[PDB]
Symmetry: C2
Subunit: 108 residues, 2 copies
């Protein structure tokens, strides 16, 4: 399964699930971690969760690849590691809030 085909699956799925700000970062000549990183926002916890889970299910259906998901059920963010592509999903207002708390030195 071609990494460009995987990229198309990822962005099509996120677009279908109404993600915003879907960014594609090509990593050729920069990093060996993956061919692409994709980053996108969701508007709620239900939405980020549905987004991530459907994407993992779709990748498995299309390719057989079992993606690693980091950050569920508490879904302020999700990372989905699909091997050739790593997908970052975030809730902008939750992230800005948590970043402030960490800037203030909370939590150690």
């Amino acid at each position: 399964f071609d990494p460009e085909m995987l990229l198309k699956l990822v962005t099509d799925s996120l677009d279908d699930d109404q993600a915003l700000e879907i960014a594609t970062i090509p990593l050729a000549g920069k990093s060996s971690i993956a061919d692409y990183m994709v980053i996108a926002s969701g508007r709620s916890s239900r939405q980020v969760t549905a987004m991530a889970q459907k994407l993992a299910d779709r990748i498995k259906a299309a390719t057989g690849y079992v993606s690693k998901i980091e950050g569920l059920p508490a879904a302020d963010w999700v990372l989905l590691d699909a091997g050739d592509i790593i997908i970052h999903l975030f809730r902008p207002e939750v992230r800005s809030f948590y970043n402030l708390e960490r800037m203030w030195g909370f939590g150690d």
Copy 2:
């Protein structure tokens, strides 16, 4: 604390701890998640762990920011979320192996 200053701290720290393939991805005009993503490799579990922990300690010492670390103590990868910068660390031979297992459909 300036995001360019934070970037310099991150890359200087990773360089000092002998990370390889240190990639800087500017996100201006692409994603709101952060100003930069940094990706780098380490050669062992001790090294990736030392790398990530020292970077978190250094960010806190220099800025007060308490970074969120994902993927320790089992350190095949680490993500360090420093707010304005997200840092991905990976062990190339471990990642290639785990990616194969997921490609083969292991683990659900």
